[PDB]
């Protein structure tokens, strides 16, 4: 470690810990920046050499974390929990968690190489027939094609290409990750991830939330299944079975927005998928980012700074060079550089993703002046919710009208059902997926799911919660969890489940602050400077305060609550139930064993 980066001496008292935390702050922004910068150089340009460099930067990060970590223990281990300064307690608490810096050097290098190799496999995997990439090629197929065989070829090709080679590395990664966090006091890595919510009843509270939401999902599923049956017929859709996992618009069946045209209740009303209009009007990536920004400035939140526009990667590079397309928002920890990296496509769902990513940036802009240890969401779910809350307003027919994307205006029960149905495809359909992913990963980290059951347990959960089935036979050579970005990239998932509930709590509160008095699902907070001030208070808090209290100050309650989401969707929840009953649907999938046949001429 460079001499300037090494910790000095501090008295072993709270006065010393404050000086310690200040000295750490100085050196940590330098260390984080080199690490983030090397990650950027790799992710926007995947080469052997960029991986080498990133690995070197990560090693320097661990060295730093180890030295400042061990000094924090040496001086403050028996006393930091009794410090008067709550923010100081949180800073020291972070610094003394070593994670992968607990590993000896050889295992640190193994760990860093595993992350790099798993990232590369995911972001460079192709399906060959001339080879299709995930983004845009396979994404477009899953979203747009209605050919059973084509969908299958993309689904199977991607799962095989990405999943199969990851499996040996994932096993090695799990074991090392566990070894690292065990020396911080956690039974397994999952326990450390869950600790961020600082709630002893976290798993039970999530389970209770899901119990309230499940009927909504069952009704949506049944209704969509029926529409798929009308299209694909009895051979490929079982009206009492799970839906084939490739037919729902998305590689992971996680959001069903893309099959809206097949399920829309009242096709005579305004077309709520404005993708056609965006293309017709010639929208590109930077228009999408600028329109998102202006929503934020309408609230008197910050614009994107010059460094964002100069640094960001907003389209897939046309020089064909390899990049991580999966959209992400970057804090370089120097209070100046902030960037999005997205292979943006001109679609309505991408417009929402742009808002999602810009929500991350806006958090980073608002808390940049906190101590480095506190530059995070009040919990991870908060960071995930910010952009989605604004996108709830943007998606409204009224708002789309204001920005030139929906010329016809209507306010009637049919138009409302269409809107709420479309939103259900994006929000309700995701809930079981958002919930299951980390149930899977928590079982893997705990050892309940050994390598010998990775795919068996994955599909158990996928069927259990989403009521989908794989459209070709799978076995334990397959590693279908690995074909989802967050697994090889070691990004936790439960945050997205929390976010999908929390965003409706946020929406409700911001709408009330805006002075809006209509139905929750027609609220648009655009240009509410009062809504803006209430959201800014959250963003400025970082992780300086318990999330329960930040939530209470914002929405008036100190807990996750499904009631705002239920209220938002209530009209369509009622309508879907009525439709399914009148069609005599079976809710659920009692033929749990059923899988579709292969197409006759597949794949030739
Ligand atoms: C779309 O239309 C709905 C429904 O409008 C209501 O019923 C229709 C059939 C018509 O007869 C309308 O005249 C009637 O308002 C609109 O929702 C309604 O909006 C108003 C707010 O502008 C609500 O009234 C307010 O209620 C609060 C109490 O909560 C009072 O403090 C206010 O004094 C005020 O009267 C009304 O409750 C609300 N009701 C429904 C049916 O949910 C909606 O605003 C409109 N949307 C758009 C985008 O134009
Ligand atoms: C992608 O990363 C590679 C490193 O793997 C970059 O290669 C360097 O490129 C500059 C300019 O072409 C040369 O002067 C260096 O000698 C290269 N290094 C090596 C080791 O080959 C490459 O430039 C990057 N591409 C982009 C557009 O950023
Ligand atoms: C597109 C988005 N990408 C992520 C990347 C997170 C990340 C974290 C660390 C390193 C690299 C990436 C995010 O911005 O949270 C994402 O994966 N998801 C999720 C997903 O697509 O699975 C669902 C969430 C709502 C809309 C977009 C969100
Ligand atoms: C796992 O599956 C591998 C390949 O897929 C198989 O081939 C297709 C045509 C179907 O038969 C499908 O049901 C199969 O999964 C096999 O190569 C492999 O040997 C299978 N078994 C093991 C132990 O890996
Ligand atoms: Ca779409
Ligand atoms: Cl999380
Ligand atoms: Mg989509
Ligand atoms: Zn996010």
XYZ file of C-alpha atoms in Angstrom, residues 153-483:
331
model
C -34.037 -21.330 -30.273
C -33.124 -18.021 -28.657
C -34.184 -19.177 -25.122
C -32.371 -22.512 -25.277
C -29.373 -21.064 -27.069
C -28.866 -18.310 -24.480
C -29.397 -20.533 -21.410
C -26.951 -23.096 -22.764
C -24.335 -20.560 -23.924
C -24.216 -18.473 -20.735
C -25.196 -21.018 -18.048
C -23.190 -24.176 -18.793
C -19.630 -22.642 -18.644
C -20.394 -20.546 -15.526
C -21.259 -23.473 -13.288
C -17.701 -24.576 -12.243
C -16.710 -20.961 -11.530
C -19.904 -20.206 -9.583
C -19.267 -23.091 -7.240
C -15.666 -21.860 -6.579
C -16.896 -18.307 -6.100
C -19.574 -19.377 -3.574
C -17.052 -21.238 -1.458
C -14.568 -18.333 -1.374
C -17.261 -15.708 -0.752
C -18.496 -17.747 2.253
C -14.936 -18.154 3.574
C -14.480 -14.359 3.393
C -17.705 -13.319 5.140
C -17.442 -16.015 7.782
C -14.397 -14.141 9.139
C -16.607 -11.037 9.472
C -18.909 -13.113 11.734
C -21.632 -14.150 9.215
C -22.788 -17.773 8.847
C -22.745 -17.309 5.039
C -22.659 -14.588 2.395
C -26.493 -14.473 2.257
C -26.627 -13.567 5.926
C -24.301 -10.641 5.254
C -26.479 -9.509 2.314
C -29.632 -9.731 4.419
C -27.935 -7.793 7.271
C -28.185 -4.608 5.187
C -31.954 -4.416 5.978
C -31.254 -4.391 9.724
C -34.469 -6.245 10.487
C -34.559 -9.523 12.479
C -37.892 -10.485 10.870
C -36.769 -9.699 7.226
C -37.515 -13.116 5.677
C -40.897 -13.516 7.450
C -41.883 -9.941 6.588
C -41.080 -10.599 2.895
C -43.072 -13.839 3.017
C -46.055 -11.974 4.464
C -45.827 -9.338 1.716
C -45.751 -12.039 -0.960
C -48.858 -13.736 0.554
C -50.823 -10.510 -0.006
C -49.540 -10.010 -3.563
C -49.806 -13.607 -4.754
C -53.526 -13.531 -5.723
C -52.846 -10.574 -8.035
C -50.116 -12.542 -9.761
C -52.223 -15.724 -10.028
C -55.010 -13.775 -11.785
C -52.670 -11.993 -14.142
C -50.956 -15.348 -14.980
C -54.247 -17.094 -15.727
C -55.438 -14.264 -17.957
C -52.180 -14.129 -19.913
C -52.075 -17.941 -20.175
C -55.491 -17.831 -21.823
C -54.347 -15.242 -24.394
C -51.242 -17.347 -25.148
C -53.538 -20.394 -25.591
C -55.653 -18.560 -28.175
C -52.433 -17.829 -30.087
C -50.266 -20.925 -29.675
C -52.927 -23.593 -29.156
C -53.396 -26.630 -26.952
C -50.215 -28.388 -27.970
C -47.942 -25.675 -26.520
C -50.128 -24.080 -23.807
C -51.760 -26.070 -21.011
C -54.597 -24.105 -19.437
C -53.941 -25.922 -16.089
C -50.156 -26.031 -16.368
C -47.133 -23.692 -16.116
C -46.533 -21.359 -19.036
C -43.465 -22.154 -21.220
C -40.731 -19.782 -20.000
C -39.896 -18.343 -23.468
C -43.350 -16.946 -24.401
C -43.658 -13.909 -22.102
C -41.664 -11.220 -23.932
C -38.462 -11.434 -21.936
C -35.533 -13.893 -21.647
C -36.295 -14.488 -17.898
C -40.085 -14.139 -18.180
C -39.544 -11.454 -15.529
C -41.579 -8.614 -17.067
C -44.385 -9.234 -19.544
C -44.696 -5.694 -21.043
C -43.677 -6.985 -24.499
C -46.735 -9.209 -24.926
C -49.161 -6.298 -24.197
C -50.340 -6.315 -27.831
C -51.520 -9.901 -27.382
C -53.436 -9.376 -24.120
C -54.773 -5.768 -24.306
C -58.435 -5.785 -23.090
C -59.803 -2.877 -25.163
C -57.828 -2.466 -28.442
C -60.161 0.365 -29.621
C -58.739 2.754 -27.002
C -55.383 4.644 -27.261
C -52.329 2.492 -27.985
C -50.357 2.764 -24.731
C -47.136 1.304 -26.118
C -45.591 4.406 -27.634
C -42.540 2.641 -29.095
C -43.971 3.130 -32.638
C -44.315 6.839 -32.045
C -40.801 7.123 -30.608
C -39.320 5.589 -33.809
C -41.670 7.510 -36.143
C -40.510 10.726 -34.417
C -36.844 9.661 -34.620
C -35.999 9.436 -30.925
C -32.474 8.303 -30.058
C -30.613 7.455 -26.879
C -29.632 10.972 -26.023
C -33.234 12.278 -26.438
C -34.354 9.603 -23.974
C -31.701 10.653 -21.455
C -32.541 14.379 -21.894
C -36.263 13.821 -21.417
C -35.531 11.861 -18.224
C -33.219 14.629 -16.961
C -35.890 17.280 -17.526
C -38.336 15.296 -15.367
C -35.749 15.457 -12.572
C -35.130 19.205 -13.083
C -38.899 19.806 -13.180
C -38.876 18.654 -9.542
C -35.888 20.940 -8.760
C -33.604 17.962 -8.484
C -30.169 18.201 -10.112
C -29.452 18.079 -13.852
C -26.898 15.555 -15.108
C -23.483 17.274 -14.883
C -21.104 17.809 -17.875
C -18.940 14.878 -16.729
C -22.004 12.564 -17.101
C -22.642 13.596 -20.739
C -18.934 13.513 -21.666
C -18.195 10.178 -19.902
C -21.291 8.069 -20.306
C -21.754 5.170 -22.746
C -25.364 5.605 -23.948
C -25.317 3.348 -27.014
C -23.665 0.034 -27.832
C -20.304 0.831 -29.602
C -20.555 0.441 -33.355
C -16.854 -0.578 -33.622
C -18.211 -4.010 -32.576
C -15.786 -4.218 -29.543
C -17.111 -6.228 -26.587
C -18.924 -4.413 -23.734
C -21.148 -5.259 -20.783
C -24.458 -4.122 -22.237
C -26.458 -4.709 -19.032
C -27.496 -1.185 -18.003
C -25.772 0.349 -14.968
C -25.243 3.635 -13.095
C -21.791 4.482 -11.813
C -20.446 6.509 -8.914
C -16.674 7.059 -9.196
C -16.490 8.278 -5.532
C -14.648 11.522 -6.435
C -17.791 13.661 -6.239
C -17.355 14.653 -9.905
C -17.628 11.627 -12.174
C -20.978 9.899 -12.561
C -21.945 7.895 -15.633
C -24.447 5.551 -17.155
C -23.372 2.586 -19.258
C -26.351 1.329 -21.297
C -26.757 -0.240 -24.761
C -29.868 1.880 -25.099
C -32.545 0.866 -27.591
C -35.462 3.069 -28.700
C -38.405 1.470 -26.929
C -40.902 2.454 -24.262
C -39.484 -0.085 -21.775
C -35.981 1.325 -22.371
C -37.311 4.789 -21.605
C -38.301 3.357 -18.196
C -34.866 1.735 -17.788
C -33.290 5.141 -18.557
C -35.375 6.626 -15.687
C -34.360 3.713 -13.426
C -30.661 4.290 -14.122
C -30.961 8.071 -13.801
C -32.624 7.550 -10.380
C -29.334 5.894 -9.264
C -27.347 8.845 -10.583
C -29.611 11.341 -8.825
C -28.987 9.521 -5.487
C -25.226 9.712 -6.126
C -25.503 13.466 -6.939
C -27.503 14.178 -3.756
C -25.319 12.295 -1.217
C -21.878 12.990 -2.794
C -20.852 15.132 0.186
C -21.456 12.441 2.819
C -18.597 10.267 4.095
C -17.784 7.571 1.545
C -19.108 4.821 3.859
C -22.571 6.471 3.827
C -22.902 6.992 0.044
C -25.559 4.365 -0.442
C -29.354 4.058 -0.267
C -31.048 3.941 3.134
C -31.326 0.337 2.073
C -30.592 -1.160 -1.391
C -34.311 -1.239 -2.181
C -34.454 2.564 -1.822
C -31.770 3.008 -4.471
C -33.753 0.715 -6.797
C -37.042 2.589 -6.242
C -36.089 6.200 -7.056
C -36.135 6.147 -10.873
C -39.078 3.733 -11.029
C -41.204 6.187 -8.987
C -40.638 8.957 -11.549
C -41.288 6.470 -14.378
C -44.709 5.734 -12.787
C -45.658 9.360 -13.529
C -44.050 9.336 -16.989
C -46.026 6.201 -18.070
C -49.390 7.822 -17.445
C -51.411 8.581 -20.601
C -51.683 12.189 -19.441
C -47.935 12.555 -19.077
C -47.216 10.795 -22.387
C -49.624 13.268 -23.957
C -47.675 16.224 -22.500
C -44.398 15.001 -24.053
C -45.866 14.333 -27.504
C -46.018 10.513 -27.322
C -49.808 10.003 -27.156
C -52.008 12.358 -29.159
C -55.375 10.894 -28.142
C -56.591 11.559 -24.578
C -59.330 9.423 -22.945
C -60.615 9.107 -19.373
C -62.939 6.079 -19.155
C -63.127 2.703 -17.421
C -61.850 0.776 -20.454
C -58.806 3.023 -20.949
C -58.038 2.663 -17.244
C -58.183 -1.126 -17.426
C -55.793 -1.124 -20.407
C -53.359 1.132 -18.522
C -53.487 -0.840 -15.305
C -53.156 -4.107 -17.236
C -50.060 -2.802 -19.042
C -48.596 -1.673 -15.704
C -49.457 -5.066 -14.155
C -47.470 -6.796 -16.930
C -44.392 -4.798 -15.833
C -44.909 -4.686 -12.051
C -47.089 -7.616 -10.895
C -45.520 -10.196 -13.193
C -42.053 -9.327 -11.794
C -42.994 -9.915 -8.146
C -42.499 -13.729 -8.010
C -39.181 -13.369 -9.893
C -37.986 -10.516 -7.693
C -38.783 -12.681 -4.670
C -37.405 -16.058 -5.856
C -33.922 -15.171 -7.135
C -32.365 -14.634 -3.727
C -34.354 -17.504 -2.200
C -32.298 -19.565 -4.633
C -29.026 -17.788 -3.857
C -29.571 -17.818 -0.085
C -30.004 -21.628 -0.321
C -26.790 -21.901 -2.321
C -24.802 -19.765 0.144
C -26.234 -21.650 3.140
C -25.355 -25.022 1.570
C -29.037 -26.131 1.401
C -28.614 -26.124 -2.402
C -25.328 -27.914 -3.295
C -23.941 -27.840 -6.865
C -25.726 -31.153 -7.437
C -29.113 -29.354 -7.079
C -28.465 -25.882 -8.573
C -30.839 -26.393 -11.563
C -33.334 -28.650 -9.768
C -33.774 -26.008 -7.028
C -33.849 -23.163 -9.576
C -36.688 -24.716 -11.533
C -38.444 -25.733 -8.319
C -38.601 -22.043 -7.372
C -39.370 -20.820 -10.906
C -42.393 -23.161 -11.081
C -43.403 -22.545 -7.450
C -43.537 -18.743 -7.792
C -43.745 -17.830 -11.484
C -45.724 -20.850 -12.742
C -43.396 -21.287 -15.743
C -41.638 -24.356 -17.062
C -38.542 -24.777 -19.246
C -39.524 -25.322 -22.900
C -36.802 -27.971 -23.378
C -35.636 -30.619 -20.934
C -32.934 -29.428 -18.471
C -30.498 -31.374 -16.258
C -27.726 -30.499 -13.797
C -25.227 -29.856 -16.567
C -27.390 -26.822 -17.232
C -27.033 -23.827 -14.966
C -30.053 -21.675 -15.791
C -29.558 -19.298 -12.834
C -26.193 -18.373 -14.354
C -27.925 -17.084 -17.490
